[PDB]
Design a protein around this nucleic acid. Structure first.
Ligand SMILES: [Mg+2]
Ligand SMILES: [Mg+2]
Lengths: 44, 149, 116
RNA sequence: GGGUUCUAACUCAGGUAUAACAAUACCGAGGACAAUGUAUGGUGGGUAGUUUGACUGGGGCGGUCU
RNA sequence: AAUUCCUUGUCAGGUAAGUUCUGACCUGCACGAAUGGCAUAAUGAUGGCAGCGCUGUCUCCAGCAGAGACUCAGUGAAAUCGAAAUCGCAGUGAAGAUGCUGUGUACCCGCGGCUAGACGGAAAGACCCCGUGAACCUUUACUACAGCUUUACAUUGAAC
RNA sequence: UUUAUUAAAAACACAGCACUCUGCAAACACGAAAGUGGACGUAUAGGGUGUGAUGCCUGCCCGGUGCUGGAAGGUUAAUU
RNA sequence: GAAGUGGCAAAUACCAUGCUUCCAGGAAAAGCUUCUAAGCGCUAUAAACGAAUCGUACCCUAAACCGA
RNA sequence: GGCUCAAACUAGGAGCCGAAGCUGCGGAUUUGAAACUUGUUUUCAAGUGGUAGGGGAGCGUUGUGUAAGCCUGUGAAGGUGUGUCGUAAGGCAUGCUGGAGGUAUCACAAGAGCGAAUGCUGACGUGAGUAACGAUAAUGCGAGUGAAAAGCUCGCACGCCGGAAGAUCAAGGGUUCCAGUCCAACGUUAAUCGGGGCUGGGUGAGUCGACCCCUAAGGCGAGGCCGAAAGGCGUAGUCG
RNA sequence: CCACUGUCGUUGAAAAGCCAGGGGAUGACUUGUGGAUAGGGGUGAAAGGCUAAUCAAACUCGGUGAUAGCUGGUUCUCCC
RNA sequence: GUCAAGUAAUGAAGCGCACAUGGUGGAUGCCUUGGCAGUCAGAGGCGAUGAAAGACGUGACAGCCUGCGAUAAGCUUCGGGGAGGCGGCAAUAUCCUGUGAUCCGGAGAUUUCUGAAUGGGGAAACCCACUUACCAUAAGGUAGGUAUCUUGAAGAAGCGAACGAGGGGAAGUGAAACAUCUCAGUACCCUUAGGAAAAGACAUCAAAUGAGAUUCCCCAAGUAGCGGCGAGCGAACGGGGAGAAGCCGAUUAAUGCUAAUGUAGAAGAACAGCGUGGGAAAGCUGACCGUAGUAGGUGAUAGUCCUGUAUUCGAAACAUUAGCGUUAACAUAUUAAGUAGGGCGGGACACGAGAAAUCCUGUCUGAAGAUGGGGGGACCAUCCUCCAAGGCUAAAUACUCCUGACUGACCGAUAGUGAACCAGUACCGUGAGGGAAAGGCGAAAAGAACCCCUGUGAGGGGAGUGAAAUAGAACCUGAAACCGUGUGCGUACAAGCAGUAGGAGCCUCAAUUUAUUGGGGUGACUGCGUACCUUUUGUAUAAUGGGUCAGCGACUUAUAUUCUGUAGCAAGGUUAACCGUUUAGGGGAGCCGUAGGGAAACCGAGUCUUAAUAGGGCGUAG
């Protein structure tokens, strides 16, 4: 049956992407937190 | 300990012993129940108790002949062999030399001799007095000890 | 000063497993089972130190009864005859005589029977 | 001690000009009202935080509690 | 009666026989008129009852086909599991015993079946009670608050 | 139409009916406000509530609690 | 190293963004064609030369995607 | 079991069995009492079942000092046997293994002792060589290659789909595509085969699509409005 | 597109399916792509449904080692 | 010899126990490249000259890591250094190097694209431009410019530890419920600095002989108070210290001298013989150095073998710290009215409206102005004290993303960072986010030429190396669970926690002048005998928990307080913070004891109550 993840690149990059993170103060805090943890993947 | 904020599984129904954190002290990689922190190990020893113990130690050293009074002990050159000779004639190769106003080249001559230390009477301690095979005290330092204790 | 438990735990478990030598299955192999089997073995041995003194008197009395009935007396009359004759021979020695020396036990029966 | 009228505060989610929104100017309509701040009475499960005893031949019901 | 406890009410119809059904009575525990009343063609994978057809639903199961099961070769799980040299019975006993008493029976070990017991597995019983536990919901419980509203002062003035 | 994953229904909706609110910067709703939806609509409209095609219809009670109107009197805040 | 043209049938594709009816009344903007404003190139005829960059394999009712 | 002048019952008598009770023998220990008197010695008396719990005495382990010591390649720690000593915790010696450390004694400090917590991690059992091997569309044989062929290739025959189980895409994936080579792992079996490993290759546009021009919903939004701050809204626009 | 009945399956081929039947099938229809509404909030032809296999208040992190008159566990030895 | 009756022994499909020898597994021990907690100092930022963080490239060589940026493991120069070298896994090839390489330190050059990202846009690492100058003639190339905001060309933006200041501000919890209250002005959100910040010079306290800003520490003191007077909350005065400072420019940024530092470096003592051993540093014998003797290595443990250590020391260049000088930016009040005070509502004060001073202010008001005003805890009088409504000000105090040196009764691979290893990785999740496992041959690869079996596989056996190969790469040691093989004994007529007390037989070692004892293995047969933990009145319980093994896993730490022991002093005992060339010595502030009674004043071996001098209460070695 239909499952929860239905991938779409535009939708992924528009809800979770780098510019979407940088558009908000809270998204920039997400990025600051990911960089402080040292993640090799900042954004999808 | 890093992480550990979420409940690892739900309380009932999984058939597992209930858990609250993955960093509980029961788990491998968990925190220490009663983790140690820095401690201050210094004690308050009473002034009179310290003085009386130094008194007791000095008397015991005389009583077992481990104290040697000399008029003076002055090395004329910062040279280890000179102090080795001066201590071999005194028959105390392994010695704590207590002198008032430790000379700034007797210190150098004593620095490299293994079981030999040179102290001024203000920086003598009970463990130093007990630890060395012999004590070589000048008469001036014995007088200072008379006054201090 | 961190203490590791490995070496002492090992030697501790080896003492128990050594006392469990010869037991069946897990009882000689695995510690949780061996340690119960060793404790129960000690419990049985304590109880049977007491019970063996009862069992051997049982055996001596049986042998004395047989020896006396061979000579025409029961145990309860033979022992009474010994106590009346002031004979202090214990049941262990009397059973030994009955088993290994029939003529001497005949003589003892004669003494008891003369005392009755 | 209440009304009435006025306009000049204030209002316009009216017209005209300013490109558009808004502001501004004027006109028009209202107008010391409305509205808002502080204080205050009412209303207020719309929303919150909580309480809602114990004994007891299981508990509730009844009874009891000094 | 989707409503009636007594209750399978009573009487009629249907069956050989009908606590259901249909019609009627009214003694409505405890119907009733827009929390609508009484009907109503059409409609409904809606509820009840009755027929024809049809049948392996059944009397009462038989035979047959395929896929497993079974045997061989290859691969190779699972829950469970204190340890087991793990029988019946009548007793006993923390009160329903493979394990205790007495007794009876029983050579050692598989495989195919089977599910009477191992108070079998599975899920720290949801029932029930307890805890000065939780939550969410209700209200004419309490105490607040939002909102709505009253008046005083301010913004706020003039004349009669 | 509905309880995705044990309930598809007699439940919800429905066209239709009634009550009630609302004169427009509407009532009402989101929002702290600005700004919005209602609606570039305007009482034959829009909101809330109940009922639920249709046919025949829809009795009595305003004591309670709401709602609407009234203000003679009683009581009554801040303030003074 | 051949043939390659006649009949009949026939789409839901095309004519057709058409036509006819209905009410529940049916995107926008640009390209495109014209008109002028401030201000100070355009239309034909050709000839030559150009048209960048990215994608392009393969699965896709699936063993390549979403379901460990 | 079996029992009848009992192996039943009543009334008496004498023997004997029978407990971790009592006695005997040896040993330990608590308290108290007496004396060489901090175990220095001998005794004596009364004691010594024990959960919750109180009191007393110790064992071992890691680490610090003692220790620039002492032990140790003539073999440390650890492992694994054996012998021996103590009331116990445990100590000592030693064979084998091991191959570089250990630590007397007395103090001192604890990450100081594990069988349970449906404890935590890893390893490995039992179930059990049991169930299953994923659509009942289906396979047979001959050749080939190969260590080996039911499964690969080729051939003949058979069967299945055919509004698909054929073909083209979008989305998503990203090399899976093609060739050669390999068969450990992966593939629910084998595999010479593969979407597996390894090495090479392969995607060619003015016209197909994107980009680009344009805008929808909806975003963002010089100025502007609003809001403790953060921010919210909104015009022109700018994206989409 | 849906999900009424039954068998099967229930350590499944599958964390909701298969098979055989069943309903709607020009409409209040189904479906692609993009967008909007966010947690006491949303959305709801209303089942407390749904809001990423999570819903009478999502998820993640943090307050936080919440609290737990409750349950479990609590490791060497000997003597009184 | 027949028959009859009776009675042994022998059996093993398999299984048990012990021992021997392996497999698996990876404990233990040793080890460390990594962590953890601090001390003494330094520093406290980076960025429009484009940061942090990335993407994509870059090599003789395929990937990853490291460095670097189309000048791409690098280019120039200035110093150091002196023989090797072209980063690691990780070697190979071509080569470079005394014409001074590699390497180290200072400076410079280059520095793709993304990202504040800044020419516009955007699904980050992409798409699309405009414009100036020049060159080209074609469809371009080179060098620039073009965001927004603030201030009048200069700045800003963004990022990043903790500590500061400020704007908002929970709840769980505690009160054995809960609402005041607590938690707590905490968590968290938001804003914004500096090396610190803030505060700071009296419109402050005190009531003493008065003192003299701020901050921090020890006391005062868990006192006075506050408080559903509950749970709790909790000062100040003053004393002792650290540090001291007062001003009206105690500002900021450059530049230039002088000094010092730092950023590479240099030299640097002294051991031999013999024996063992694979190897000597260990043993024996005898020497030497020492301003250098407990450093790390080296084939076992080294003052004399190496690197080091003691000691002495270097700088072309750049940074930093100070002192000086100078510049250019900003600042430079002149004594303070919408102020003090007041009404209402709140907040802060230890203080919850209280008898509530004092501070702050949303709302409404509103002085005096030195012949005046503020405070002294309602308020009034007197007395003391001090002048708000202008601004500033070092130190002593807070901290650690970092740099250097040093330290540890800190860990040692389930520990210590989550991370010793290509870890914030794999993996999981739409996402925010969650989040592992995983170290060790040997001294040196000497990492096993060659031969044999096998499919040119895997794996092994020889040969060889090595001290050692059950050290052979899954490699130190190599436990247990678990699973084999071998040997000995037992076991196929017998009912149950599997042992125990006895006990025959057999097997095996030793003695012993020779089948008897002793040791070991097994255990026919007899008696007895229902696991452990937990929880209970009571459990074989058919009540709980555990499949097993290994490893880990639970009464701590800090402070206060009371009692006990012990030690020192003793009617006295003891200092704290601090200072200290630091366990000492100094520091007597304070605390406890030495007297109690009473609400208190007050009195005191007494005192309280009372009219009472009575009675009665409480009182009469630390
Ligand atoms: Mg769901
Ligand atoms: Mg090994």
């Amino acid at each position: 049956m239909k499952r929860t993840f239905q991938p779409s690149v535009i939708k992924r990059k528009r809800t979770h992407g780098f510019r979407a993170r940088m558009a908000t103060k809270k998204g920039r805090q997400v990025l600051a937190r990911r960089r402080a943890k040292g993640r090799h993947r900042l954004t999808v | 300990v890093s992480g550990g904020g979420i409940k690892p599984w739900r309380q009932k129904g999984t058939g597992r012993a209930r858990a609250g954190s993955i960093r509980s002290p029961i788990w491998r990689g968990g925190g220490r129940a009663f983790a140690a922190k820095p401690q201050d190990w210094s004690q308050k020893v009473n002034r009179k108790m310290y003085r009386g113990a130094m008194q007791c130690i000095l008397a015991e050293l005389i009583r077992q002949e481990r104290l040697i009074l000399v008029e003076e002990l002055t090395i004329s050159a910062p040279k280890t062999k000179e102090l080795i000779a001066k201590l071999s004639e005194l028959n105390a190769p392994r010695a704590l030399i207590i002198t008032k106003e430790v000379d700034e080249n007797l210190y150098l001559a004593a620095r490299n001799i293994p079981h030999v230390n040179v102290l001024d009477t203000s920086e003598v301690d009970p463990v130093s007095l007990i630890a060395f095979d012999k004590v070589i005290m000048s008469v001036e330092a014995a007088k200072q000890f008379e006054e201090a204790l | 000063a961190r203490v590791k438990r490995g070496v002492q735990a090992n030697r501790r478990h080896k003492k128990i497993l050594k006392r469990a030598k010869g037991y069946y299955g897990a009882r000689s192999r695995v510690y949780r089972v061996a340690v119960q089997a060793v404790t129960k073995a000690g419990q049985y041995a304590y109880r049977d130190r007491r019970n063996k003194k009862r069992t051997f008197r049982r055996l001596w009395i049986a042998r004395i009864n047989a020896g006396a009935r061979l000579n025409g007396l029961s145990y309860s009359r033979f022992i009474n005859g010994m106590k009346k004759a002031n004979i202090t021979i214990d049941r262990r020695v009397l059973a030994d005589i009955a088993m290994h020396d029939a003529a001497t036990f005949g003589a003892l029966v004669e003494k008891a029977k003369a005392e009755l």
